[PDB]
Structures are given as C-alpha cells and as structure tokens.
Amino acid sequence: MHIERLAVDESVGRAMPPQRFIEALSDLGVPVEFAGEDEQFGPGDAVASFGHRDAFLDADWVHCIRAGYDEFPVGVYEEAGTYLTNSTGIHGTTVGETVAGYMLTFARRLHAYRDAQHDHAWDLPRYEEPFTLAGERVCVVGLGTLGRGVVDRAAALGMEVVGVRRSGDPVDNVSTVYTPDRLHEAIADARFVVLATPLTDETEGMVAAPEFETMREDASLVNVARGPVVVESDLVAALDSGDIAGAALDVFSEEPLPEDSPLWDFEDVLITPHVSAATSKYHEDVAALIRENIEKIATGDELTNRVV
Amino acid sequence: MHIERLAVDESVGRAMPPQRFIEALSDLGVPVEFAGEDEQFGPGDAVASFGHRDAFLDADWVHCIRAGYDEFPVGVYEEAGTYLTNSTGIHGTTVGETVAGYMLTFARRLHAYRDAQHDHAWDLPRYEEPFTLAGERVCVVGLGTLGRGVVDRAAALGMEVVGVRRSGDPVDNVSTVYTPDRLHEAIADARFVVLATPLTDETEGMVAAPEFETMREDASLVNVARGPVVVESDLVAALDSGDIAGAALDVFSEEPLPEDSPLWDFEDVLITPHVSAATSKYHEDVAALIRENIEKIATGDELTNRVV
Ligand SMILES: NC(=O)c1ccc[n+]([C@@H]2O[C@H](COP(=O)([O-])OP(=O)(O)OC[C@H]3O[C@@H](n4cnc5c(N)ncnc54)[C@H](OP(=O)(O)O)[C@@H]3O)[C@@H](O)[C@H]2O)c1
Ligand SMILES: NC(=O)c1ccc[n+]([C@@H]2O[C@H](COP(=O)([O-])OP(=O)(O)OC[C@H]3O[C@@H](n4cnc5c(N)ncnc54)[C@H](OP(=O)(O)O)[C@@H]3O)[C@@H](O)[C@H]2O)c1
Ligand SMILES: [Mg+2]
Ligand SMILES: [Mg+2]
Ligand SMILES: [Mg+2]
Ligand SMILES: [Mg+2]
Ligand SMILES: [Mg+2]
Ligand SMILES: [Mg+2]
Ligand SMILES: [Mg+2]
Ligand SMILES: [Mg+2]
Ligand SMILES: [Mg+2]
Ligand SMILES: [Mg+2]
Ligand SMILES: [Mg+2]
Ligand SMILES: [Mg+2]
Ligand SMILES: [Mg+2]
Ligand SMILES: [Mg+2]
Ligand SMILES: [Mg+2]
Ligand SMILES: [Mg+2]
Ligand SMILES: [Mg+2]
Ligand SMILES: [Mg+2]
Ligand SMILES: [Mg+2]
Ligand SMILES: [Mg+2]
Ligand SMILES: [Mg+2]
Structure with a gap:
C-alpha cells in the first residue's frame, strides 16, 4: 500500500478527543484529517476508528483504536482487500x-x-x-x-x-x-x-x-x-x-x-x-501504533496487530 | 527479670477481639489473663495494652500493641523502672x-x-x-x-x-x-x-x-x-x-x-x-512479638522494640 492520508473517524471521541489525536500525528508525513459519519474513502486512505463503517471498505487500511475487534466484520475486510489492525499491546x-x-x-x-x-x-x-x-x-x-x-x-x-x-x-x-x-x-x-x-x-x-x-x-x-x-x-x-x-x-x-x-x-x-x-495519554499511545505501521507500510514490512 | 504472668488489658479490644489474642498466646508458658480497667499489678507482671494506665507502673514490663506509643508517658516509665515495648515491625x-x-x-x-x-x-x-x-x-x-x-x-x-x-x-x-x-x-x-x-x-x-x-x-x-x-x-x-x-x-x-x-x-x-x-490476623502478628520478648526476657537478651 501507498498511504496518502489518515482519516480520523469521529467515533474515536468515545475514547479520546479527536483533535488531540490528530495533533499527536502532525509530523506523520501524511495529512491527518477529521472524518465525519458520512465521509467517503478511497485508494490511499487509512482510517482510525472505534467501530466499523461499511464506507471504510473503500479504504486501504483501517486501524481499530480498541484491542477488542469482535464488533468488526473480519471476513468482509478480507473479501474487500482492506487491511484491519487493532490496538492490542497498549493497555x-x-x-x-x-x-x-x-x-x-x-x-x-x-x-x-x-x-x-x-x-x-x-x-x-x-x-x-x-x-x-x-x-x-x-x-x-x-x-x-x-x-x-x-x-x-x-x-x-x-x-x-x-x-x-x-x-x-x-x-x-x-x-x-x-x-x-x-x-x-x-x-x-x-x-x-x-x-x-x-x-x-x-x-x-x-x-x-x-x-x-x-x-x-x-x-x-x-x-x-x-x-x-x-x-x-x-x-x-x-x-x-x-x-x-x-x-x-x-x-x-x-x-x-x-x-x-x-x-x-x-x-x-x-x-x-x-x-x-482509560488514560489521559491514550491519544499518544494509539498514535505510536499508527506511526509504527505507517513506517512498516513505507518499508514493506508486515503490519503490527494485523487481524486480516 | 522473672515474668510470672501476662495480663491482657481490656483496651486491646480496640484493635482485636481479646479472646483471639489470649488463645493465640496459649503456648506462652506463663499464664495469660484478661485484665479489666481497675486491675492492680506487681512484680513479675507483664502487661499487653492499647493505651496507658498508671496501674502498669507497678508491673515489670508493658507491651503496647500499637506501633505508635505517643500516648504513653515514656519518661515516667523510665523513672518507675518499668520496661516499655511497642509493636513496630508488623504493619x-x-x-x-x-x-x-x-x-x-x-x-x-x-x-x-x-x-x-x-x-x-x-x-x-x-x-x-x-x-x-x-x-x-x-x-x-x-x-x-x-x-x-x-x-x-x-x-x-x-x-x-x-x-x-x-x-x-x-x-x-x-x-x-x-x-x-x-x-x-x-x-x-x-x-x-x-x-x-x-x-x-x-x-x-x-x-x-x-x-x-x-x-x-x-x-x-x-x-x-x-x-x-x-x-x-x-x-x-x-x-x-x-x-x-x-x-x-x-x-x-x-x-x-x-x-x-x-x-x-x-x-x-x-x-x-x-x-x-487492619488485618484478620492481627492477634497472631502481635502474639509473635510477645512470644519473642518473653523468651528474650527469660534469657537476659535485648528486647525487641524497647522504647524505655
Ligand atoms: N477497557 C477494557 O475493559 C479493555 C481494554 C483492552 C482490551 N479489552 C479486552 O481484552 C481482550 C484482550 O486484550 P489483550 O490486548 O490482552 O489481547 P491479547 O494480547 O491478544 O491476549 C489475549 C489472550 O487471551 C488468550 N485467550 C484466547 N482465547 C482464550 C480462551 N478461550 N481461554 C483463555 N485464554 C484465551 C490468548 O491466548 P494465547 O496467548 O495462548 O493465544 C492471549 O493470552 C480484548 O480482546 C478486549 O476484548 C478490554
Ligand atoms: N493504623 C495506622 O494508621 C498506623 C499503624 C502503624 C503505625 N502508625 C503510625 O506510624 C508511625 C510509624 O510506624 P513505623 O512502624 O513505620 O515506625 P518505625 O519503623 O520506627 O519508623 C519511623 C520512621 O520515621 C522516621 N522519622 C522520625 N522522625 C522523622 C522526621 N521528623 N521526619 C521524617 N522522618 C522521621 C524514622 O527515621 P529514622 O529511621 O531515620 O530514625 C523512621 O524511618 C507510628 O509511630 C504510628 O504513629 C499508624
Ligand atoms: Mg507454565
Ligand atoms: Mg513479561
Ligand atoms: Mg442501588
Ligand atoms: Mg460526586
Ligand atoms: Mg503514568
Ligand atoms: Mg501547592
Ligand atoms: Mg480538584
Ligand atoms: Mg496472540
Ligand atoms: Mg515543629
Ligand atoms: Mg514547615
Ligand atoms: Mg524542626
Ligand atoms: Mg527492604
Ligand atoms: Mg535494590
Ligand atoms: Mg458529605
Ligand atoms: Mg459492612
Ligand atoms: Mg495475605
Ligand atoms: Mg462457589
Ligand atoms: Mg463444582
Ligand atoms: Mg544497644
Ligand atoms: Mg528506628
Ligand atoms: Mg548517622
């Protein structure tokens, strides 16, 4: 994948202020943008989200901001060729x-x-x-x-x-x-x-x-x-x-x-x-995972915490 | 110093049920007796207590069942020749x-x-x-x-x-x-x-x-x-x-x-x-200290936790 943009789904607000997370990723090397509920996606898009939206299947990669991914339709991501990662390792x-x-x-x-x-x-x-x-x-x-x-x-x-x-x-x-x-x-x-x-x-x-x-x-x-x-x-x-x-x-x-x-x-x-x-630094802890996987994508390494 | 008896002041009930403490000390090898607020003391008496009583100054040795002994008149014990120990080390x-x-x-x-x-x-x-x-x-x-x-x-x-x-x-x-x-x-x-x-x-x-x-x-x-x-x-x-x-x-x-x-x-x-x-085993913890010092007294060794 060539990632060109990180979309931050509003649902991340369930765990952290979206703007705090966006700001933590200001030097990532791609733009990081707030995404509302009816945002559409495409080639080059990574998305960070709490839960699943069918619109995300147009993106290259979804990062779930939770460790637990039981609310994601995993088989559907496989079908769609959309990568899914979770946030295990930070809690x-x-x-x-x-x-x-x-x-x-x-x-x-x-x-x-x-x-x-x-x-x-x-x-x-x-x-x-x-x-x-x-x-x-x-x-x-x-x-x-x-x-x-x-x-x-x-x-x-x-x-x-x-x-x-x-x-x-x-x-x-x-x-x-x-x-x-x-x-x-x-x-x-x-x-x-x-x-x-x-x-x-x-x-x-x-x-x-x-x-x-x-x-x-x-x-x-x-x-x-x-x-x-x-x-x-x-x-x-x-x-x-x-x-x-x-x-x-x-x-x-x-x-x-x-x-x-x-x-x-x-x-x-x-x-x-x-x-x-819960932690007042959750934004930074999740951001670290994103930075890691952006670097792994960039260098053709296997993704950390890849579910499908 | 010949200890002939261990009196258990009723005030120990402020920290633990006195009968549990008394039974814990059944192995002590001197008699272990409950002492009400008006008991008198004499040569060979050891006393286990929460608080101070002027009556204890006739006993040989007082063991405070607390770590803090700030409510005991330490200078008075010294003048009277009564040993005072505390329960530091168990909390x-x-x-x-x-x-x-x-x-x-x-x-x-x-x-x-x-x-x-x-x-x-x-x-x-x-x-x-x-x-x-x-x-x-x-x-x-x-x-x-x-x-x-x-x-x-x-x-x-x-x-x-x-x-x-x-x-x-x-x-x-x-x-x-x-x-x-x-x-x-x-x-x-x-x-x-x-x-x-x-x-x-x-x-x-x-x-x-x-x-x-x-x-x-x-x-x-x-x-x-x-x-x-x-x-x-x-x-x-x-x-x-x-x-x-x-x-x-x-x-x-x-x-x-x-x-x-x-x-x-x-x-x-x-x-x-x-x-x-607080602990459901406080009676055992304090009893261990009493047992140690009973022995040490009998044998002229330095007491554990001697205040004066
Ligand atoms: N806020 C919260 O309350 C909160 C936060 C984070 C996560 N969670 C929940 O906690 C879960 C675990 O997160 P994590 O990051 O610790 O995941 P993890 O690092 O992937 O660890 C999951 C552990 O569960 C074990 N396991 C899987 N099936 C099992 C079974 N049937 N019986 C016993 N053990 C089993 C795995 O065994 P092996 O190592 O042998 O494979 C592994 O040791 C998440 O999926 C999420 O649901 C809750
Ligand atoms: N239920 C409770 O809340 C509870 C239970 C037990 C005890 N306590 C209280 O806690 C007290 C301490 O008990 P413990 O068994 O830990 O006593 P300890 O083992 O004798 O320790 C007392 C410590 O306080 C230090 N100290 C004395 N004066 C000081 C000062 N001016 N500034 C700073 N440190 C000073 C001593 O310093 P050095 O070692 O350098 O001499 C020593 O390290 C007791 O006297 C009692 O009042 C409360
Ligand atoms: Mg083993
Ligand atoms: Mg380890
Ligand atoms: Mg109710
Ligand atoms: Mg309130
Ligand atoms: Mg900390
Ligand atoms: Mg201040
Ligand atoms: Mg306040
Ligand atoms: Mg595993
Ligand atoms: Mg002062
Ligand atoms: Mg000051
Ligand atoms: Mg001073
Ligand atoms: Mg140590
Ligand atoms: Mg060390
Ligand atoms: Mg009130
Ligand atoms: Mg209750
Ligand atoms: Mg225990
Ligand atoms: Mg049962
Ligand atoms: Mg059964
Ligand atoms: Mg000495
Ligand atoms: Mg000391
Ligand atoms: Mg010194």
Whole structure:
C-alpha cells in the first residue's frame, strides 16, 4: 500500500478527543484529517476508528483504536482487500493498575469506607473483613497484554499467580499455565479470578453457573475483558446465593449497564464504566501504533496487530 | 527479670477481639489473663495494652500493641523502672497495601466510580482525569516499617521513589533519601506525599500551609501516621483553595473524625477510620512479638522494640 492520508473517524471521541489525536500525528508525513459519519474513502486512505463503517471498505487500511475487534466484520475486510489492525499491546499498564486497584480495594475494604464517607460514619470493619493480597491466589484467564499487566503487578504484590491461555505456553510470573479445557482446575482455589480474554466463539459464556459453583465462596470475579464472556444473569444469581463473594466489573453484556441491573446494588460489586484502560495519554499511545505501521507500510514490512 | 504472668488489658479490644489474642498466646508458658480497667499489678507482671494506665507502673514490663506509643508517658516509665515495648515491625504489608490502594484509587478514579455506583450512573471520567502510577513520583516521609512497606510497593508499580527520614541513611528502593530539614525539596515534585512518621516533638505540625504551598497542585497527601503530623485546618484550607488536589487520610487530630469536618465532603479525599493496618490476623502478628520478648526476657537478651 501507498498511504496518502489518515482519516480520523469521529467515533474515536468515545475514547479520546479527536483533535488531540490528530495533533499527536502532525509530523506523520501524511495529512491527518477529521472524518465525519458520512465521509467517503478511497485508494490511499487509512482510517482510525472505534467501530466499523461499511464506507471504510473503500479504504486501504483501517486501524481499530480498541484491542477488542469482535464488533468488526473480519471476513468482509478480507473479501474487500482492506487491511484491519487493532490496538492490542497498549493497555497493560492501565488495566494492570486498575485490576491491582480492584483487588486492593477488596482486601483493604476501601469501597466500604467510601460508602461510609457519604454517611460521615466512622464504621469499623468486622474483624474478619480486612486481609492482605500478599499470599493470596489469583487466576488470570487470558495471558496477553491485559493478563500480563495484571500478572506482573499481582506477583510483585506477593500473590500466588496461576492462569489460562489458548496455547498453554509458559508466561513469566505465572506458576502454572492451564489450557482452556482446564478452567475449573485453574479457578478452583483462587481468591480472585480475572478475565482478560477476547470475546470469541470459545470464550462467549465461558463463565457461568458451573464456574461460580467451582469458585471459592470467598472469591471475587474481575471482568475487564468483554461482558458476554460471563453469563451475566448467572453472575447475579451467584452473588445473590453466595456462590462467590463479589466482583469488580468494567464490562457488561449491555453497555451502558442498565439502571435496573441488580449488579449496581451489591456492596461487594465494583462497577466501572468500561474505563479500566482509560488514560489521559491514550491519544499518544494509539498514535505510536499508527506511526509504527505507517513506517512498516513505507518499508514493506508486515503490519503490527494485523487481524486480516 | 522473672515474668510470672501476662495480663491482657481490656483496651486491646480496640484493635482485636481479646479472646483471639489470649488463645493465640496459649503456648506462652506463663499464664495469660484478661485484665479489666481497675486491675492492680506487681512484680513479675507483664502487661499487653492499647493505651496507658498508671496501674502498669507497678508491673515489670508493658507491651503496647500499637506501633505508635505517643500516648504513653515514656519518661515516667523510665523513672518507675518499668520496661516499655511497642509493636513496630508488623504493619508493613497491611499499610503498604492500603497506601498502594489509595494511590491506585486516585490514578484509576475508582472512588469517583464508586460514588456513581450509588446513583446507578454510568459516568465517564473527564479525559484528563485517569492516569497511571507508573512513572509518577512519590515522596515517603518516614522510612521505617510503614514507609518501607509503601516504598517497596510503589517501586514495584514503577513509581519514582524519594523519601525523608531522621538519619538520612540509605533505604532500598529509595532513589534519594533526604533529612527532615530538606522536606520542601523532597515534596516539591511529588505526585504523592505519604506520611509514615511517629508523632514526636519534631513531627507535630510538620505538614502545614507552607508545605501545601510547596506541593504540586495536582498532588495528593496520604496520612497513615498520626493526625497531628498535619495541621488539619491548613489541610482543609489547602483543599478548598486547590493548593493540593486531594488526600487519603486514615488518621485525624480527633478520632472519630467529627461528622461536621469538611474533610468528609471533598470528592478527592478518602476517609478511612484508622484501619490502614487492619488485618484478620492481627492477634497472631502481635502474639509473635510477645512470644519473642518473653523468651528474650527469660534469657537476659535485648528486647525487641524497647522504647524505655
Ligand atoms: N477497557 C477494557 O475493559 C479493555 C481494554 C483492552 C482490551 N479489552 C479486552 O481484552 C481482550 C484482550 O486484550 P489483550 O490486548 O490482552 O489481547 P491479547 O494480547 O491478544 O491476549 C489475549 C489472550 O487471551 C488468550 N485467550 C484466547 N482465547 C482464550 C480462551 N478461550 N481461554 C483463555 N485464554 C484465551 C490468548 O491466548 P494465547 O496467548 O495462548 O493465544 C492471549 O493470552 C480484548 O480482546 C478486549 O476484548 C478490554
Ligand atoms: N493504623 C495506622 O494508621 C498506623 C499503624 C502503624 C503505625 N502508625 C503510625 O506510624 C508511625 C510509624 O510506624 P513505623 O512502624 O513505620 O515506625 P518505625 O519503623 O520506627 O519508623 C519511623 C520512621 O520515621 C522516621 N522519622 C522520625 N522522625 C522523622 C522526621 N521528623 N521526619 C521524617 N522522618 C522521621 C524514622 O527515621 P529514622 O529511621 O531515620 O530514625 C523512621 O524511618 C507510628 O509511630 C504510628 O504513629 C499508624
Ligand atoms: Mg459492612
Ligand atoms: Mg495475605
Ligand atoms: Mg496472540
Ligand atoms: Mg507454565
Ligand atoms: Mg513479561
Ligand atoms: Mg462457589
Ligand atoms: Mg463444582
Ligand atoms: Mg442501588
Ligand atoms: Mg503514568
Ligand atoms: Mg528506628
Ligand atoms: Mg548517622
Ligand atoms: Mg527492604
Ligand atoms: Mg535494590
Ligand atoms: Mg515543629
Ligand atoms: Mg524542626
Ligand atoms: Mg514547615
Ligand atoms: Mg501547592
Ligand atoms: Mg480538584
Ligand atoms: Mg458529605
Ligand atoms: Mg460526586
Ligand atoms: Mg544497644
């Protein structure tokens, strides 16, 4: 490909101010231009976007500004000869930190204290409530950029770490790596189970009633992956019945999470609005990927994070 | 020194259920007895207590179950020939985790999300709000058990770490160690300033209006030491004026914090009720210290954590 222009779809506004991103790419060597909803594309065009538009199939290359590309019609890009790349590789620090934050919140009871802060109440925990992450077990399901960001911070905090990935291959700081057919073994003894997989045919509904049964009654589920990896109604039922203790949830089967979801109301559920990867430098972090792939295109190298 | 008995002052209940502590000490090899507020003491008596009682001055040895002994008349113990020990050395993991939790809460905006959760509101942060601890600077004031617990976790999360202590001597994971006369130099460029000193003559009112002026306007104060290390009214004024961004506060000039304190109402203040060191295993942690010193007393060895 010969790229002559980078179009910035308005949908990037869902994660970052489009003008900040445009400005980050001012010395890219092609012009970088805001594109509205009904923009048309053609030869020489690269497009950066949150989601898919059929108009993009006229372009040479679409870069999805998310790691997750499950909302893109991948087979159609192949057909059209349009390259598609994603933003995997940039969310390890942000998500890793958020997840460390969730686990420390539960161990140290920070969320209960925040609730009491609204009441101006000096409410002391029950003696058995506060604990330390040091010496506790975490199972990280998915061991890529997100999962490793979680693993490394968990290990540094003194946690025991196991995990699950497709290949079963070793991962630094993970004591035992399981394949997905051994999910129950992986999750059974864990104080925290963290979900960091893409949404695929295989992962959809992976965590359901039987998994909540297997999990320790004192355990918490963390979902920073995609909502439908979990059977959300089963999660509610598990929380109600005490099959698990709680959950930190950044992603949901329907987003925004509807007001009537029971999930909002559990004391030991943390709801976050799909922001575990949020950062005031997202524009720069995505721009780096674009610059990298422009240089790879320019020199005939294989594209980074090429989906199809 | 012949220790014939260990009295467990009822005040230990302020930190842990006394029966759990008593049972933890069943192996001690002297009798272990509960002591009410009017008990009298004599030769061969050891006392485990939260607070001071003049009655203890007839005992041989008092073990304070807290790290902070600022509420004990140390000069009086010396005159009376009563040994005083404290519980420093056991709070590094708990407080270190809590402080990591505070910092991650602020970086990842978890407290704001929790507030929104009460209202079933899917409220996205402002773009500029979320950040990462990785690459940010923390200044830890006090580099003992608490300070090192903080330092080690901050460094492992990728923070730049400087600090302040009395002696100026090197501390692992602290890039620059300042003496207390260089406090302003130490705090000026820090995103987080953590207080982990005892309450002493020198530390009382250490952090006041001029320190808040010096601090970055985007910085947060963390106090896990003692309330009076900070001039609390100056903290309120600094928060109101935007001289600093916020604070995580576990300790206060008056505890419980009065309901009418302005500190409750700042979005970017976390109030916790003197629980940064709370743990369901505190009884075991303190019992270990008692066991160690019982032995050391019996054998004429130097006591652990001897104050006077
Ligand atoms: N804001 C957010 O909440 C946020 C942000 C970024 C990403 N995400 C989500 O997180 C997903 C992962 O992102 P990433 O950048 O970490 O992707 P990545 O680096 O490609 O890693 C994906 C990991 O998932 C593993 N995996 C795939 N199928 C699996 C299965 N059936 N069971 C267990 N593990 C499986 C892969 O295994 P192998 O390594 O063996 O192939 C790999 O370790 C994205 O697709 C997106 O949905 C969410
Ligand atoms: N629940 C809670 O919030 C909680 C729990 C435990 C303790 N605490 C409080 O935290 C305090 C510290 O406990 P710890 O176990 O860490 O004590 P520690 O191990 O004795 O350490 C005290 C540290 O403070 C330093 N220090 C003393 N005066 C100072 C000054 N003027 N400026 C800067 N640094 C100074 C000392 O310096 P040198 O090492 O150079 O002498 C030492 O590094 C306790 O006294 C207590 O008040 C609070
Ligand atoms: Mg409660
Ligand atoms: Mg622990
Ligand atoms: Mg892969
Ligand atoms: Mg392995
Ligand atoms: Mg690695
Ligand atoms: Mg279960
Ligand atoms: Mg089962
Ligand atoms: Mg509600
Ligand atoms: Mg950062
Ligand atoms: Mg010392
Ligand atoms: Mg010296
Ligand atoms: Mg060390
Ligand atoms: Mg070192
Ligand atoms: Mg002074
Ligand atoms: Mg002075
Ligand atoms: Mg001063
Ligand atoms: Mg200032
Ligand atoms: Mg502000
Ligand atoms: Mg209020
Ligand atoms: Mg608010
Ligand atoms: Mg000596």
